[PDB]
Design a protein around this ligand. Structure first.
Ligand SMILES: C=C1CS[C@H]([C@@H](OC)C(=O)O)N=C1C(=O)O
Ligand SMILES: [Zn+2]
Ligand SMILES: [Zn+2]
Length: 228
């Protein structure tokens, strides 16, 4: 995997890359955050911003250089900084942004810029397709409240990659990370719903670890069960 400015990029599959940015948090130093970049025909689709506007501009620059296709749309997976910190950059590049309607409602109070468009979901978790027009291989699933009440997840058609975002931790993880906004009562169930929603997916991309096996889902759920 490749360094570019302060960011790191790793190709996970033919038309799927994972982007990584860092933030110095005081007392623990640097923290990595992963999103996805996806080439679909003549378009590129982004899943999650970087921590900051500048890092997200860097993402766009790298897409210009390594793929040099226009960015059709971004999806952000909940209203925290690792996932929405760079909404202004995307808007300034005139890229269409999408989030959970709840994310857009929460964003002002979590100090984020709302996306331009709001996804809504069926009772079974699946995105209403009207609200996610022309997402190509991106299948968006709302697993229920866990890390945040608004956390959403994205599988990529034509790969065995699903993206858990901050919901899923790594199979050798010691805790569940920041639970200050979390739904402790439903977290295990939401992790497992994410599993069942993408049952064949075998490469689980996450916010804060390198891609992992489905034991990430299992281990995260088992960890959440001990918090209920
Ligand atoms: C490990 C951390 C601390 S750093 C990042 C934080 O970014 C603002 C957040 O989204 O809570 N998230 C997690 C997490 O449990 O996923
Ligand atoms: Zn978060
Ligand atoms: Zn996180």
């Amino acid at each position: 995997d490749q360094r570019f400015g302060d960011l790191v990029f790793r190709q996970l599959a033919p038309n799927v890359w994972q982007h990584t940015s860092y933030l110095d948090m005081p007392g623990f130093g640097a923290v990595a955050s992963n999103g996805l970049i996806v080439r679909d025909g003549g378009r590129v689709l982004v899943v999650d911003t970087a921590w900051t506007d500048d890092q997200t501009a860097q993402i766009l620059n790298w897409i210009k250089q390594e793929i040099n296709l226009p960015v059709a749309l971004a999806v952000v997976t909940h209203a925290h900084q690792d996932k929405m910190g760079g909404m202004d950059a995307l808007h300034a590049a005139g890229i269409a942004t999408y989030a959970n309607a709840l994310s857009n409602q929460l964003a002002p109070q979590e100090g984020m810029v709302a996306a331009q468009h709001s996804l809504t979901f069926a009772a079974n978790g699946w995105v209403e397709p009207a609200t996610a027009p022309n997402f190509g291989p991106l299948k968006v699933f709302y697993p229920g409240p866990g890390h945040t009440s608004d956390n959403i997840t994205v599988g990529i058609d034509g790969t065995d990659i699903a993206f858990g975002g901050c919901l899923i931790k790594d199979s050798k993880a010691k805790s569940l990370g920041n639970l200050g906004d979390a739904d402790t009562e439903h977290y295990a169930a939401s992790a497992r719903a994410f599993g069942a929603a993408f049952p064949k997916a075998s490469m689980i991309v996450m916010s804060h670890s390198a891609p992992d096996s489905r034991a990430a889902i299992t281990h995260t759920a088992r960890m959440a069960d001990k918090l209920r």
